Amino acid sequence: SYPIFTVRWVAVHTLAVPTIFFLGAIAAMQFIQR
Amino acid sequence: DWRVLVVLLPVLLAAGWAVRNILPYAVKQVQ
Amino acid sequence: MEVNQLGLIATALFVLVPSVFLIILYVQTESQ
Amino acid sequence: MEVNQLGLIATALFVLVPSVFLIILYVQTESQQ
Amino acid sequence: GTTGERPFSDIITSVRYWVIHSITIPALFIAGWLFVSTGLAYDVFGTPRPDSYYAQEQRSIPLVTDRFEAKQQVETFLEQLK
Amino acid sequence: EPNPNRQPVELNRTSLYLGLLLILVLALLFSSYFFN
Amino acid sequence: GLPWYRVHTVLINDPGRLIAAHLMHTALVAGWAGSMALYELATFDPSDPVLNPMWRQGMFVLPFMARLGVTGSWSGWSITGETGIDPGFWSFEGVALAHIVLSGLLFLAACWHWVYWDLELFRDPRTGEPALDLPKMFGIHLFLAGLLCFGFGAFHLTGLFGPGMWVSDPYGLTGSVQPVAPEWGPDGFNPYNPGGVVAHHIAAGIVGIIAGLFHILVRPPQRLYKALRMGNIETVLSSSIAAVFFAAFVVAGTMWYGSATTPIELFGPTRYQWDSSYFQQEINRRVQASLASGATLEEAWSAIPEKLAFYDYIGNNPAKGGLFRTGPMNKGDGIAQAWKGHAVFRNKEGEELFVRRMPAFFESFPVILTDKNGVVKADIPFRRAESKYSFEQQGVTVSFYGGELNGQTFTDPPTVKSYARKAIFGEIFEFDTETLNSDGIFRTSPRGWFTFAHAVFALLFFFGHIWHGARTLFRDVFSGIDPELSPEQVEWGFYQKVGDVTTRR
Amino acid sequence: RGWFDILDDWLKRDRFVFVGWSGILLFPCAYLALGGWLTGTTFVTSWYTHGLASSYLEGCNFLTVAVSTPANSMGHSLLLLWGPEAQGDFTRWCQLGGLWTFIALHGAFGLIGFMLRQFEIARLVGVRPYNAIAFSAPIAVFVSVFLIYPLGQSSWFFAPSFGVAAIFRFLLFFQGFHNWTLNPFHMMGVAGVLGGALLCAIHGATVENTLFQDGEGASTFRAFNPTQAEETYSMVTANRFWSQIFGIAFSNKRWLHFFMLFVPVTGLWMSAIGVVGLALNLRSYDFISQEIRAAEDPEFETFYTKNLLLNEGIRAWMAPQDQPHENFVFPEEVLPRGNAL
Amino acid sequence: TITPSLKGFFIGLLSGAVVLGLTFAVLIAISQIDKVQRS
Amino acid sequence: METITYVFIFACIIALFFFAIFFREPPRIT
Amino acid sequence: METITYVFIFACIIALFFFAIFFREPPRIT
Amino acid sequence: GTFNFMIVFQAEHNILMHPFHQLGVAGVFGGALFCAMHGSLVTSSLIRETTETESA
Amino acid sequence: ISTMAFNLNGFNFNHSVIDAKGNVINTWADIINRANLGMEVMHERNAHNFPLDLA
Amino acid sequence: ARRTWLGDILRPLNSEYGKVAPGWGTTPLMAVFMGLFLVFLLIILEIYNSTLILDGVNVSWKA
Amino acid sequence: GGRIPLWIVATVAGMGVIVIVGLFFYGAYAGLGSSL
Ligand code: CLA
Ligand code: CLA
Ligand code: CLA
Ligand code: CLA
Ligand SMILES: CC1=C(/C=C/C(C)=C/C=C/C(C)=C/C=C/C=C(C)/C=C/C=C(C)/C=C/C2=C(C)CCCC2(C)C)C(C)(C)CCC1
Ligand SMILES: CC1=C(/C=C/C(C)=C/C=C/C(C)=C/C=C/C=C(C)/C=C/C=C(C)/C=C/C2=C(C)CCCC2(C)C)C(C)(C)CCC1
Ligand SMILES: CCCCCCCCCCCCCCCCCC(=O)O
Ligand SMILES: [Cl-]
Ligand SMILES: [Cl-]
Ligand SMILES: [Fe+2]
C-alpha cells in the first residue's frame, strides 16, 4: 500500500525528463555536418 | 509552428499512455 | 636592497605583541 | 629631522621587552592567590 | 527506517514501471532529437548554424557594443547575412 | 562589592605551541611584503 | 577556565560593565579620529589644491571633515585654496581636539560604570536578576536616531542652522561647501543628486521618529519574541552585525562607483571615469568649441585648466595600485608640478596619430599609435629585425599645445618615444620625484583604500552574523547535544514531523 | 491551529526529500541555476558577447562548453529578461548573456537556501549547526569571485564564465594580469585546501589502520555497529604511532575534528579576501626592491623577474581575443618574444 | 510619466507576485489535505 | 637587516619544534 | 616618527599615574 | 620557483586540459570538502559533557 | 606529471570548431592557447636557437 | 543593588522585561511594511543599475 | 511489482549508457567539432 505520486516523484521527474530530452537533442547533434 | 508540434507530439503520447496505464491506481490515493 | 625601513618594526611587533599575549596567558594558567 | 632610523626599534624594544617581563610576572602572581 | 514512499528496488523491477517507461523515455529522447533535427533549437536560442557565423566576405565578429541599443545591434548583424 | 561574573582564563601549553607557530609562520609569510 | 576566545562573555549578564566596555570602545574610536586628524594636519601640504590635492597625499579623514563643512585651519589656509579665512573654533584642529577631549571624558565614564556596576536600574523588579528590556530600548534608541537623523538633514545640510555639504560641478573643478535644498520627487533617489541626501534624512528621520514611538508603545507579539529570542542580547548582536555589513557594502559600492557623497575633489577620480574617457571627452569638447570661435591650437589647449587635465591621467585612477605599495600617490609617480601640455603626435605625412591608452588591467602596455580611423600607423617594436611601424621609419614627431611645452615640437625619435610612453597614461605632467624619493610605481587613492577595507570588513562581518545568529538560535545545545537523545527523534519515519514527538507513528 | 502552523507541519514532514521553509528558496533557485547551466551549455552561443562558440549544438565538448559572461558593454546590468536590454525577448536575452546573470543570481539565492536548510534541519534534529557555519566558506568564495570581483571591474564580462575551460582561462588571466600566485591570501588558501586534503587522507588512513578486531572477517567493515558505545579504533595506539613517527600527535578527538572544520574553512575565507582586493586591481604584483635593483643591474635575475616576463607574454598574447571589445591590434613586431620562439 | 522600463519593472513585479502566490496557494492547499496526526 | 629577520624567524620555528616535541604536555591515559 | 615616540611614552606614564593612584594595592592594617 | 615551474608546464603540456590533473583537483578540492564536512559533522554531534564556560 | 614527462599532453582542441566555410570559430580552448603561447614565447627567453621547444 | 537619582528616574523605562502582545499581534502589519520596503529598495537598486530608467533621472556625474 | 530482476535492468541500463557515450566520442571525430 504505497503512494505512487509523492513529493519524491515530483523531484525525480523534475530532473529525469529534461535529462532524457536533452540526451536525444545531444545525440542528434553528433550527426550535424558543417 | 509546425515544428513546435512534432517536438511536443511524442511527449503527449508518453503522458497519455502513462495516464491511461496509471489512471486507476492514482484514483485510489484520493485522500 | 632598497626595502621599506618600517618593515623591520612592523615584522618585529607583528611577532612580539601576539606572542607576548599568549605567553602571559600560558604562564598564569600554569601557576593556578 | 635626519634622525637614526633604528632609534625607533631601539626605543620600541627598550620599552616593550622589559615591560612584558614585568607584566608576565605580575599576572602569574595574581592567579596564584 | 522508511519514510513511506515505495522502494526504488521495487519500482524499477516492477512490470507496470516498464510498461509506462518503455514508451515515455524514448518519446522524450525522440522529442529532443526532433528539437535539433527540425532546427528549432537554433531559432529558439539564437545559436548560429554553421553557415551563419559570418557573412561570406567578412572576418570580424558581431560583437555588441551598446547596452541599450544592443537588441537592435544583433538584429542588424542578422539582416546583413541575407 | 565584588563582581560575580569574573572567571579565570586559561591557555594550555598545547594552545601556546599552536599559537606561537601560527604567529611565527604568519610573520615568515608576510614579512617579505612588509619589506617589499 | 574560560578559553582565550571567550573572555569577553563575562559581560553578558552584566549590563553596567557592558556599558563600561562600550564606553571604552567609544573612547578608543573618538581618540583614533582625533589622533588620525592630527597626523594628517602635521603632514598635509595645503599649498596646491590643483595638482596636489588631499587625495594625492594619503589623507583619509581630512575628506570626511571637509565633506560636511570643515574646510579651514587655525593657521589660516582653507582646502579650497582661500588664504585668510577665520574658521572659528570648528577648524580641522578644533575638531581633532574635541574628539580627544570627548575620548577622555568617555574614558572616565567607563571607569565609573565599571566600578559601580551593581546599579538597581539594571535588575528586574519582579525577580532581582539583571534584565534589559531590549524591545523598549530599541524603541528609545530608534526614536533618538530618527531625531538626530531628521535634525542632521533639516538643519546641518540645508544650512538652516549649519554649513551644508560639499558639492561640485560634474568635472570636480569648483567644489565647495554649500547649503543644499531637499529634492523630493524622483531624482532624489539618483545617487548623484545631493538634494536627495537632504530629503533622505528629513523623510527617513520622520519615519524613524514614528517607528521609534511605535516601538516604545507596542510590545512584540509572543510569536516574534520566541522566534527571535528577544530576551537574549546575542539576538541583537546577530541582527546588528547583519545591518552593519549591509551598511558596509553600500558605502564601498558608492565609494567605488561614485555618488554625491563621495566627491572626486575629496577622494579622487573613480576608475570608471578612466574607462569611459569622461575627462578626455570634456577636454575635447572644450577644445572643439575654442576652435569654432577662431582660436589657434595653442590658445584652445592653453585654455584647458590644469585641474581638468590632471584628471585625465591614469596615475589618478584608483585601480592602478597595489596592496603592498604603501603611502600617498605622491610616493609613486611624484608630486605633480605642472601640465607639460597636450601632446599631438604626427607622422612624416603630416597625419595626426593617437596613442592607444593603457587600460587599468595592464601593469605594462605597449606603445601603439593609430590614425583617426584605428589603423595602426606607428609603434615601438620589440623585435626590430622585421619592424614596419617604428617611429624612425614613420617619421613620427610630437608637438605640444598648452602647459610647460606649449608650441614646442620634438623630432629626434628618442625624445618622441619617451613622450609617447607617457601618453599611454593620458595627459603628461612634470613630477617632483626627489622630495619624497618616489619610486615610479602607481599607488591607489583613498577611494581605493576605503573601498578595499570596507568590502573586506563587510564580508567578515557576514561571518560574525552567522556565528552569533547560530549561537542565539541554538543556545540550548551550544555545549553539546542531549546526552540522552533518543534514536527515535533522528531515525527515519518514526515521527511524521521532524523533531516533533507528538506525531509518533 | 492556524494555517501557518498547518503549513509548517507539512513542510517539515519526514519524507524522502525534506523540504522545510528553506526549500521554498532552495529548490526553485538551485534547479534554475542547474537547469539554466545545462540549457546554456547544450544550446546557447557566446558569439555576440565573446566571439566564441560555447554549446554542444555548435560542436563544443564538455570541457569547452560554457555559459559565458555578458558583453562588456552591459556593465553590471542585472540583465533582467524584462529589462531595457532584452525587452522581454527570450531569444535575444540568451544572445546578450542573460543566462549568466540568471545562473549567478539564482545560484547565490540557492546557496542562501542551502545554508538556511542546514540551520533548519540542524534545529529540528537537535544538533549544533557547525555544518552550516563551515558552509560559510563556499559562500564566501562564490560571492567574492562571481559577484564582488566583477563589480569592482568594468563589467560582468570579467567574472568567471561557467565552464571547464572557461575557468582555466580565468586561472591564467589571474596569473598574467594579477600575479595571483604571489598573493599571500591565495597562498593561505592554498595551504588550507592542501592541508585539508592532507588532514582528510591522514585521518581516514589512521582510523582504518588502528581498528580493533571486532569481527572475524577479513573485510573489517561489518564489525561496526552504529549504535555501539565504544570507539571503533584505538586513539591510544594512533597517538603513539604518530608521536614516534612525526614527533607530535593528536590526543583529543574533539580538537582533531574541530581542526578539520577549521583548516579548509579558514583557507577559503582567506582566499576570498584576496579576491576582494583583486576586484580593485589591489594586487600583490611586485616587489619594489627587486624592481629597483633589476632596473639598475641587468645581471640581477631571480625567479620573481622570470615569472613577470611570463605574465607579460600572457597579457600581450591573450588580450586581443580575450577582450575583443577593446579592439586591440598588436602588430607582430610589438609582441614580446624571446629568441626563436 | 510611465517609461518602457517602468513598464518592464511592473511586469516582473506582477510576475514574481504571481509565481510566489501560486506557490503558497498550492502549498497551503496540500498542507490542509495532508494533515499530520497527533494522539 | 631583512636577511637577519627572515633567518631569525626561521630559527625561532625550529626551536619551537624542539620544545613542542620534547616538552609537550605528555598525553596521559586518564 | 620621533615626535610620536616621545609623546607616546609621555602619554603612557600619565596613564600609569592614573592606575597607580586609583588602582593601587590598598594598604590594609595588619 | 614553484610557480615558474607551473606556468611553463602549462605552456609545454596544457596540464589544465589533462584529465589526470583534473582528477588531482577533484582529489584535493574533494579532500578539503570532505575534511570540512567530517569535522563539522562530528563537531555538530558532540555529546554535552561540559558547561558553556569551558572548552567543549 | 609522470606521463606528461613523456610528452603525452592535455587535450588539444585548438581550431576544433570551424564553420561551413572553414573559418575557425574559437572556443574557450583557443583562448587558453593564446595564453599558453605567451608563456611559451617568453619562458627562458635567451635559451632557444631553433624554432621548436622540443624538450 | 545601588540606587541613584538618575537610576530611579529611568527605572520605568527598564521594567517590562518579558512583556509580550498575545499571539501574533502586529506581525501582519510588519510584513506589509517589509514588503513595501523590499519594493522600495528594489527601485533604488535598479535606478542605480540603469535597469529602471525614469524621466528626469540622469544617473551620471552630469546630474 | 518486483518481477524483472535487478541484475538484468542494470546490465541493460549499463549497455544503454555505454552506447550514448560511445556516440558522443564518435561525434568528437565527425561533423561539428572534429576540426575537419
Ligand atoms: C521612501 C519613501 C518615499 C516618500 C516618503 C516619498 C514622498 C514624496 N514623493 Mg517620492 N517616490 C518614492 C519614495 C518616496 N516618496 C519612490 C521609491 C519613487 C519612485 C521613483 C517615488 C516617486 C515619486 C514621484 C514620481 C513623485 C514623488 C513625489 C513625492 C511627494 C508627494 C507624493 C505625492 O502625493 O505625489 C503626487 C504626484 C504624483 C505624480 C504621484 C506620485 C506618487 C508617488 C510615487 C508617491 C510615493 C510616496 C508614497 C507616499 C509611498 C511611501 C509610503 C511609505 C511612507 C511607507 C512626497 C514628498 C511627487 C512630487 O510632487 O515631488 C516632485 C512626484 O511627482 N515621488
Ligand atoms: C578603514 C581603514 C583605513 C583606511 C582605508 C586607511 C587608509 C589610508 N591610510 Mg590610514 N590608518 C588606519 C586605518 C585606515 N587607513 C588606522 C587604524 C591607522 C592607525 C594604525 C592608520 C594609520 C595610518 C598612517 C600612519 C598612515 C596612513 C596612511 C593611509 C593611506 C595609505 C594606506 C597604505 O599604504 O596602506 C597599506 C596597507 C597595507 C599594507 C595593508 C595591510 C593588510 C595586511 C595584509 C595585514 C593583514 C594580514 C592579516 C594579519 C592576516 C591574518 C590571517 C588570520 C586571521 C588567519 C590611506 C589613504 C598613510 C598616509 O598616506 O598618510 C597620510 C600613513 O602614513 N594611515
Ligand atoms: C559588533 C561586533 C562584535 C561583537 C561585540 C562581538 C562579541 C563577541 N564575540 Mg563575535 N564576531 C564578530 C563581531 C562581534 N563579536 C565578527 C565580525 C566575527 C567574525 C570575524 C565574530 C566571530 C566570533 C567567534 C568565532 C566567536 C566570537 C565570540 C564573541 C564573544 C567573545 C569575544 C572575545 O572574548 O574575544 C576575545 C578576543 C581576543 C582576546 C582577541 C582577538 C584578537 C582579534 C582577532 C584581532 C584584534 C583586532 C584589532 C584590535 C583591531 C580591531 C578590529 C576592528 C577595527 C574591526 C563576544 C560575545 C566568541 C564566542 O562565541 O564566545 C562564546 C567566539 O567563539 N565572535
Ligand atoms: C525562490 C524563488 C525564486 C527566487 C528568489 C527568484 C529570484 C530571481 N529570479 Mg527567478 N524564477 C523563479 C523563482 C525564483 N526566482 C521561478 C519559479 C521561475 C520560473 C517561473 C523564475 C524565472 C525567472 C526568470 C525568467 C527570470 C528570473 C529572475 C530572477 C531575479 C529577479 C527577480 C525579480 O526581479 O523579482 C521582482 C519581483 C519580486 C521581488 C516579487 C514581488 C514580491 C511582493 C509581492 C511585492 C509586493 C509587496 C507588498 C507591497 C506587501 C505584501 C505583504 C504580504 C503580507 C502579502 C532573481 C534572482 C530574472 C533573472 O534572473 O534575470 C537575470 C529573470 O529574467 N526568474
Ligand atoms: C583622560 C582625559 C583627558 C585626556 C585624554 C587623552 C589624551 C586621550 C587620548 C586618546 C588617544 C590618542 C587615543 C587613540 C586611540 C587609538 C586607537 C584606538 C588606535 C587603534 C588602531 C588600530 C585598531 C589599528 C589596527 C590596525 C593595525 C595596527 C595595523 C594595520 C591594520 C589595522 C588598521 C587593522 C582629558 C585631559 C582630555 C580630559 C580629562 C580626561
Ligand atoms: C533556464 C531557463 C528556464 C529553466 C530551465 C530548466 C529548468 C532547465 C532544465 C534542464 C535540465 C534539468 C537538463 C538536464 C540535462 C541533463 C543532461 C545533459 C545529462 C547528461 C548526463 C550525462 C551525459 C552523464 C553521463 C555519465 C557519464 C559521463 C559518466 C558516468 C555515467 C553517466 C551516465 C552518469 C526557464 C524555463 C525558467 C526559462 C528561463 C531559462
Ligand atoms: C517591457 C518588457 C516586456 C517584457 C514582457 C515579457 C517578459 C516577462 C517574463 C517574466 C517571467 C516571470 C519570472 C519572474 C518571477 C521571478 C521572481 C520571483 O518569483 O521571485
Ligand atoms: Cl622561464
Ligand atoms: Cl634551441
Ligand atoms: Fe573521524
Side-chain angles (χ1 to χ4, degrees), chain N residues 18-58:
Chain N
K19 188 204 199 75
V20 292
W24 280 102
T26 33
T27 290
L29 192 76
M30 182 190 75
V32 167
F33 280 114
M34 289 188 56
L36 286 163
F37 197 30
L38 160 155
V39 165
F40 161 75
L41 283 186
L42 214 104
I43 290 160
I44 279 174
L45 171 55
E46 299 196 14
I47 279 153
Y48 213 154
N49 195 241
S50 279
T51 291
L52 175 59
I53 304 98
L54 294 171
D55 266 293
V57 188
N58 174 217

Side-chain angles (χ1 to χ4, degrees), chain E residues 14-50:
Chain E
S14 97
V15 177
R16 181 179 76 207
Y17 177 87
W18 286 115
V19 183
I20 299 152
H21 294 92
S22 295
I23 279 78
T24 50
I25 290 187
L28 289 171
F29 198 80
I30 284 166
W33 186 292
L34 296 167
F35 191 52
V36 171
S37 31
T38 64
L40 184 66
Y42 293 111
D43 299 328
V44 158
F45 291 114
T47 302
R49 296 176 179 88

Side-chain angles (χ1 to χ4, degrees), chain G residues 456-468:
Chain G
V456 170
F457 293 146
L459 184 60
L460 291 171
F461 264 70
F462 168 79
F463 180 84
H465 167 51
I466 279 307
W467 173 255
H468 293 288

